[PDB]
Symmetry: D2
Subunit: 121 residues, 4 copies
């Protein structure tokens, strides 16, 4: 048995402009796994959502085809995670978004890359 995993119970959108997005959020109990670390799925969801925001900031609509993520450092309760998303390639039919998460001490938590199919403007 285990508890539900939730993401974006709180957040602040600091920047969302022209393929560049910055969002902060506070790690809470629903963010965690059984070992008291930020859940792998929670962290991925932070990245994915900010990828979607990048797509919107480009004035586009899109759907994710593929995503890859590297976990570097555990996130902990009360951490303020800064999620920065950037469109690193804007193609005709596809976009590639890089998203990285750093904690309040500037240490890299995780990084992810999203391969998006643009469905509209």
């Amino acid at each position: 048995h285990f508890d539900a995993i939730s993401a974006f119970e709180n957040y602040e959108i600091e920047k969302m402009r022209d393929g560049h997005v910055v969002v902060t959020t506070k790690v809470v109990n629903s963010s965690l796994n059984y070992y008291g670390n930020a859940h792998g799925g929670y962290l991925f969801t932070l990245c994915d959502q900010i990828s979607g925001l990048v797509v919107i900031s480009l004035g586009l609509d899109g759907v994710t085809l593929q995503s890859s993520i590297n976990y570097l450092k555990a996130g902990k309760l009360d951490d303020v995670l800064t999620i920065k998303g950037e469109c690193v390639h804007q193609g005709r039919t596809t976009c590639v978004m890089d998203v990285d998460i750093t904690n309040q001490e500037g240490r890299n938590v995780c990084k992810a890359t999203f391969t998006m199919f643009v469905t509209g403007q």
Copy 2:
């Protein structure tokens, strides 16, 4: 502005034995994105959690180094998603888990691969 994304508000563990895990869950409103599809992060979290369960079913403890996921078909409200995880490679220090999600009609929703570092027994 957007709503929180949640995963495992409900579930049933059908099978969890020797590196093979099957878990069902019902897609609900907190599962969805703004377009009314199962959120990319939600689906990833379903897969990741079942990967962790595979690790446990092997009698091991581990941490995810890297994960990749392919989105094939949208999940929808009230879908019953069947999440099946399998350890496809059990190494000395690393494990590779394949996890796939199918809906109640047997259609493939998504598939993911997790590269785990075994930290204990």
Copy 3:
């Protein structure tokens, strides 16, 4: 200093039909890295080429957007590697190919997934 890495100096196409591909090849010296193992790029290239063959076998043309690979066991000189490719998802606009490599002892060497844009 290091030597060039080559792939497909030899191969045998056992099957190439309707999204299902099997190709065999023998690991040679040009296949190897400094440690005498099959080079990661060599193994990846085997997989990618067979992905392209799956694409051809479906009567389609496509361009690879993204690829992921997991290395499981080292390949060695004189290994006979069996490369099997399958289209695990055939969409209207995208295809997903799974490719796996096993050696002559049936041991899993590596596996990869290719995300293709149908052109």
Copy 4:
């Protein structure tokens, strides 16, 4: 039928120091796929080899567990490709290498991430 795919028939190592690597190479005929573009496996092998070089430059030895690559723009015959590698995370047990390839016009060709187990 298809020809062998080769990588590093030529190269110049511009920098290999403390986790930072730059290597250049000229795309040749053995680099190409049937469509006359740089082969996906060729590009990947360029990236992987430079990842291995980052590893060496850190004074470490390692084995690649997993790799991901995104293809952004086709490489062409006679392109001069600049391959840049960096260790973006150096852990005790694992390293993560980012590798990117740009052509002579400064256009991004591809980028890849390597997940290495330090041995």
